[PDB]
Amino acid sequence: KKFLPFQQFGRDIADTTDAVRDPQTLEILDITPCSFGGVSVITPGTNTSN
Amino acid sequence: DLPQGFSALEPLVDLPIGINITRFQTLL
Numbered sequence: 061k062k063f064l065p066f067q068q069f070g071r072d073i074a075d076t077t078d079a080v081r082d083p084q085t086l087e088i089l090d091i092t093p094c095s096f097g098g099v100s101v102i103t104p105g106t107n108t109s110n
Numbered sequence: 111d112l113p114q115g116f117s118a119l120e121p122l123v124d125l126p127i128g129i130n131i132t133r134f135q136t137l138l
């Protein structure tokens with residue numbers, strides 16, 4: 061990101077902070093939320109198998 | 111004669127001075 065010298069952080073449209081200027085090293089870092097995904101379970105009937 | 115166009119001003123200075131203002135001057 062082309063962060064301008066004054067800019068402290070950026071946001072997702074949900075207000076949740078997308079990226080931050082680190083307070084000890086002036087690097088601009090993205091904050092992605094930790095890895096997730098929906099768990100569909102595919103099964104015969106328990107009448108047939110577990 | 112102010113030139114027609116668009117350009118976004120960037121914050122360069124923050125003054126935590128708390129001063130009451132209502133008038134001003136320019137220094138040629």
Ligand SMILES: *[C@@H]1O[C@H](CO)[C@@H](O)[C@H](O)[C@H]1NC(C)=O
Pocket residue numbers: 083084085
């Ligand atoms: C904080 O400390 C480190 C180690 O001395 C230094 O390199 C860094 O520039 C300091 N950060 C700020 C914002 O002054």
